[PDB]
Structures are given as C-alpha cells and as structure tokens.
Amino acid sequence: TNFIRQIIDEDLASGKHTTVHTRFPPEPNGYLHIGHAKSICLNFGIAQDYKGQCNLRFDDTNPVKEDIEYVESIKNDVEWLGFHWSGNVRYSSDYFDQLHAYAIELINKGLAYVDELTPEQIREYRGTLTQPGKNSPYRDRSVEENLALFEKMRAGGFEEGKACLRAKIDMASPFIVMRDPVLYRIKFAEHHQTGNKWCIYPMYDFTHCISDALEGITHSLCTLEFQDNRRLYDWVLDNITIPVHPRQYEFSRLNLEYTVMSKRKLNLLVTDKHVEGWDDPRMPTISGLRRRGYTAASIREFCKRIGVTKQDNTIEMASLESCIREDLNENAPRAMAVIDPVKLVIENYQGEGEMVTMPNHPNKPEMGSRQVPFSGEIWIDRADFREEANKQYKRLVLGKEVRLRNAYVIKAERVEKDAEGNITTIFCTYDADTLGVIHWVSAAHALPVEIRLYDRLFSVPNPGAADDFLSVINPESLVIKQGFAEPSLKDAVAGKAFQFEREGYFCLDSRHSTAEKPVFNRTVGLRDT
RNA sequence: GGGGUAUCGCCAAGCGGUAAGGCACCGGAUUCUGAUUCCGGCAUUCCGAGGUUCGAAUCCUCGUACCCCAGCCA
Ligand SMILES: Nc1ncnc2c1ncn2[C@@H]1O[C@H](COP(=O)(O)O)[C@@H](O)[C@H]1O
Ligand SMILES: NC(=O)CC[C@H](N)C(=O)O
Q1: Are residues A122 and A81 in the same domain?
Q2: How far, in Å, is the centroid of ligand 2 from the Cα of A215?
Q3: Are residues A372 and A459 in the same domain?
Q4: Count of CA atoms in the C-beta half-sphere (13 A) of A369
Q5: Is A352 a catalytic residue?
Q6: A44 and A142, same structural domain?
Q7: Domain limits at A403?
Q8: Which of A2, A22, A450, A481 could link A43 by a cystine bridge, Cβ 3.0 to 4.6 Å?
C-alpha cells in the first residue's frame, strides 16, 4: 500500500472507477534505468493487483532525439522484468492525426494561435518566476488566419522556429506552464515511425493527456517535476471534445548513491566511451544490471522495498545489493574460483590426484553435489596466506594449518619468493585422513578465467551534483583479474549466477566470455565484516 | 511568485490515542564459505515555536530547511 493505491481504492469504493488502467510511457531516447524499473513496477504492478490493464507507450514526439534502437531495447527490458502490457505497443505518433485535429478544435475555439515570435523572443515575452509575461503581438489573429497559418506550418511553408502553434491561456499565470504553452513546433526531421509525413510535431503537454484519454487510462502516474504540468494537462482535456478525463498523480523519482539516473548523463558516458555501452555492467540501466548479474526478481523486490511516496530520496547502494544477495544466497549454486592465484604444492601428496565431493549448496542438500578434482599442486588466493599475521587471521599461516574447502587440512612450512621478494610457491603437507578455511583449485584441472571485479562507477555519493560529473568517475569501477576456476564452470551458462565461495556472486557472458577464454562478472561481493 | 515535501544513518508505516517494518549498525549463538541462519539492542520522539484537546506525529498559527518550474525537451 502507498498513497496511490489508496487513491485507487477510494475511486473503486465511491464508484468513480470500476477498473484501473495505467501506463508506462518512456521516450525512446535512451535505455531504461533502475528508475524506470520503479515506474514499471508501479504501473504494471497496480494493473495486475487490481485485475486491470497497463499499456506500454512510447512517447515519441521529438524525432531528433529518438531512435528505433531504443524502442527495441525498451520492449526488451520491460519483458525481462516480468511484465506484460495491454494489447499492442502504443506510440504517441499513432495519434498525430488525432492531435492535429484537436489542435484545430482549439484554434476554432480561439484557444490557440500561430505565433511568429522567434525562439528567443518567446522567452523574452514569457516573463520570470516573479514577473508576469506579456501577450505576443500575434496573439489575437482571427480563427481563419490561425487556421491558414497552421496549415502553412503543416505544409512546410515555414522554416524552423519561424512559427509555432501556442495555446491561448494566461501570460500572467503564476504557473509558468500556463503562459501560452506551445502545442506545435516545426522540425524537418524524419520520424522513426512516421518517416517524413510530418514536419510539425506535438509538444509533450499537449500529447500526453490526449494519449492517456484516448487509451482510457484511469490513473496517469508520473514523477514530481510534472506537478505544475498537471494544470496544463487538465486544461487541454477540459477544452477539447473528449469523453474521459484521466487524473494525474505524481510520486518522487528514484535516486541511487554513487550513480547518475539521468539519460543525458548516461548518454554522455556512452557517447564519450567511458563505459562500454548502455549495458555496461557498471551502468544503472536495466540491461546493465542484467549483464551485471542481477535477477529481475531482485529488482522487483528492490522497488517493493523502497516504496512509493512524494518525498525526495536517495537510496543507498547497500539496499540494492541486499536484494540481490538475498536472491542469490538462496538459489545460486556454489563453486571454487581463485581470483588472485599463487601456487601451493603439497610435497606430502602422492599421485596425479583424486576426486573430492563438494555440495552444490551447503544449507541446501536438495540442490545435489558434484565431484571436484583435488591434487598436489593447487591454486589459492594470495590473500589467504600469511607468514605471520595477528591472532584474528583465521587463514593459512607459515607454520600453522588451515582446512582446504571440502578437502584436507594442510600445514604451510616453507614459502619461496622471487626477485622482488614476491612469493611464488607455498610448500605445505596434508593429512592422510582429514575429511579457518579457504577455497582452492587444482592447478592441473584449472580453467583459466578472466574475472571482472566491478565497483561503484563514481567516487562520490551524488556525482549528478558535481560541476563535472565525468571528472568524478571511479578509476577502479572495473578491475580485471586473470584467475583459475574449477573445471566445473566449463559449462557455465551466460546469465546464470554462481556463488564463488568466500568471494561473491559471479556470472558469465560479460559480452566477452568465449569458449577458449571465459569471462565472469562479479555481480556483488559477499558481506565481509 | 507558484507548485511540492519535511518521522531513527538511508528508505518508510502511522490519517487524534499516546511511534510498524526494511536496509545499515552494535552484541551473542550456530556454521569446514570470517557467508548464510539465528536470538538480543537500537528515535520517552516525529523540522521549530505557540495554540485547541483528557489526549496529537496525527487539527490550527506563525516560522525554518530542502526539491521543482522562466526548452519551439520529456
Ligand atoms: N528516476 C526515476 N524514478 C522513477 N520513475 C522515473 C524516473 N525517471 C523516469 N521515470 C518514469 O518513467 C517514465 C518515462 O521516462 P522518460 O524516458 O523520461 O519519458 C516517466 O513518465 C516517469 O513516470
Ligand atoms: N506524464 C509522464 O509520466 C510522462 C513522462 C515523460 N515521458 C518523461 O520523460 O518522464
């Protein structure tokens, strides 16, 4: 429950509505991000909880900023999150003929006129936050003139910016949005849906309310920056001949620490190549999270936890990571992998090796087990061996022993260094029958793996509020290591996550993982206290 | 000017009956993943100051802080 579901409840009770119909209206000018996910969960979630409908609509009213590539990926992300829209995918452009007719209705009613104030003059005439604007000198043309001039605009008889269609409201309204908002502007640009049939395009405020009404939307849900816009939303519908009047309700947008949730900024990271692309695992895009290894279910859980309110908020990264850990901690099978390898030989071991049984998931025997190869030459993480270290250190210490995960106990007794004095091989002995702790991988059966450790994209909590957000990128958002994985991962399937015991959750693909050299992305590290 | 919001570090219930839950955090117990699991603690107070009431975070008054609006962007 949230303030919006309560409003719906009350409309159902009072009989104002007998069904709920919502919509997710993204503009196809970029990929969807976790913020869109909050909106997707809200609109599609309400629809299914109330046995209603939710449309997927591409608000494609500005051709120069959109692309068919985006509409393609957006349908992909919505589907991946686990939601289905009502009927066919809709497009604002599907209503261009309708919008054009409604503009004509307004003109016929003296509520719209063709203005020829230049793009600079319109602002000079607009007024300020504390001073009323003033009437354009072209504001009182006759119905006939506006009609003729509007057709000229439509026909291509005006250069760009040389004319626009404006609503006739109030140049002195405290709501800046009501100061004769522009309904149409000229743009000789091919539209990804209508090609070159139009050279004039409808503005957002004129388009959105009419699209909602025609679609039968009951509750139009948007973010807080459109609160002022609601007044123009209602003005348009109140002044044209349309049978329903969808009501808008705004909620606060999502903000995540250490990241940016702006398409213009996300686009800049992609265009200047500071990330691989929109689906870079460090990106807060739905596709980037998917490639990072998050589950749609964990994103839905997250959206469920953060709530829906009217308060400005900035969720912490810990909250998101908790959601993915909960999912993976329960379902991700375990495996051995050494990210920072150093050789360790068991001079005590005899033979070419043997096989040891390891649980696919400790706390869950129902997930079965597997046979893993053990030998006298294995790999362990350098960080797990210490010649000295204090008393806390529960790992392998020169002269002390530790349990090899699901295997034997070993005692380090003779280390060996190189030129710069860097250890190159730890010599230990093992107990014939012995079956802290550390993971390991048999060197002879090791699968060479590239491991990509990811971290926060930016080094500050609120990069979006920096003078130059790019100058605050975290140089270690991605750190590539070459390690060794148990042969078992040879059959790892892209997308599917695994828990590399004592390290974290990882998954394949990474767009780079091939047959010869597999690449794994660290979805998220384990809680290391 | 106008439109909005102010409850534990970060989210968020509470809609006049005298403060849910989640994340984070501090303890203890389990555990061959210092993970998980598991019990235990964590705002005598809800931006501030008055008012009304038997009684308020929940109503009124005046303040204070922050967010949004001057694209022919959405
Ligand atoms: N950060 C955000 N948090 C929540 N909802 C958002 C966010 N950004 C955009 N939306 C929603 O997503 C819809 C489409 O976004 P856009 O691609 O900007 O048109 C908007 O109408 C909002 O309802
Ligand atoms: N009323 C709406 O939610 C439309 C929002 C608009 N598509 C955007 O860019 O967020």
Answers
A1: no
A2: 16
A3: no
A4: 11
A5: no
A6: no
A7: 340-446
A8: A22
Provide the token pair at A370.
């597997």
> Is A37 annotated to bind ligand?
yes
Residue nearest to atom 15 of ligand 1 (CA): A26
Residue A525 pairs with which residues in a beta bridge?
A504
Protein residue whose Cα sits closest to atom 14 of ligand 1: A26
Tokens linked to A162? 């040389």
A86 with A219, same domain?
yes
Q: Entry resolution in angstroms?
A: 2.5
Domain count along chain A: 5
A150: which residues sit within 8 A by CB, 6+ positions away? A103, A104, A107, A114, A165, A184
- Experimentally, the structure was elucidated by X-ray
Q: Do A196 and A97 lie in a common domain?
A: yes
Which of A42, A210, A223, A251 maximizes ligand 2 atoms within 8 Å of its Cβ, making it the mutation to test the pocket? A223
Ligand in nearest proximity to the CA of A26? 1
Is A485 among the domain residues? Answer: yes
For A106, A204, A215, A248, A514, the CA distances from A209, given in Å and listed in that order, are 15, 9, 10, 9, 48
Contact A398, A384 (CB under 8 A): no
Q: Which of A402, A422, A446 finishes a domain?
A: A446
For A280, list phi and psi in degrees, rounded to 5: -65, 135
CATH number of the domain to which A51 belongs: 3.40.50.620
Give the residue among A81, A64, A468 at the shortest CA–CA distance from A260: A468
| Residue A257 annotated in active site | no
- Amino acid at site A45: G
- Rounded to whole angstroms, the Cα distance separating A308 from A318 reads 19
Within a domain: A524? yes
Whole-number Å distance between alpha carbons of A484 and A422 = 19
Which tokens belong to A334?
A: 């375990």
Q: Phi and psi (nearest 5°) for A475? A: -60, -15
Q: Is A253 a catalytic residue?
A: yes
Alpha-carbon gap, residue A430 to A433, rounded angstroms: 9
